[PDB]
């Protein structure tokens, strides 16, 4: 499936809605779901949420 399990933040992402996982550039995000082309699901610092797929670099 080519799923992404980890991704590096390329840019800062500010969460503007309650379902969003914000991060700063360079942070390594755990990717839980990479199948939606726009919004991926991740975990970071014990927070779960959605973030833009093209804001990160899949690792490995």
């Amino acid at each position: 499936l080519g799923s992404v399990r980890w991704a590096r933040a390329l840019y800062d992402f500010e969460a503007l809605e309650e379902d969003e996982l914000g991060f700063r550039s360079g942070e390594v995000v755990e990717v839980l779901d990479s199948s939606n082309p726009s919004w991926w699901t991740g975990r970071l610092h014990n927070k779960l949420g959605l973030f833009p797929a093209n804001y990160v670099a899949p690792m490995m």
């Binding site: 809605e17 779901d33 939606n36 082309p37 726009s38 779960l48 959605l50 833009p52 797929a53």
Partner: peptide, 12 residues
Amino acid sequence: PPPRPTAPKPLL
């Protein structure tokens, strides 16, 4: 950064 996505978000 790039523009935010505008697609509807899936549920979690």
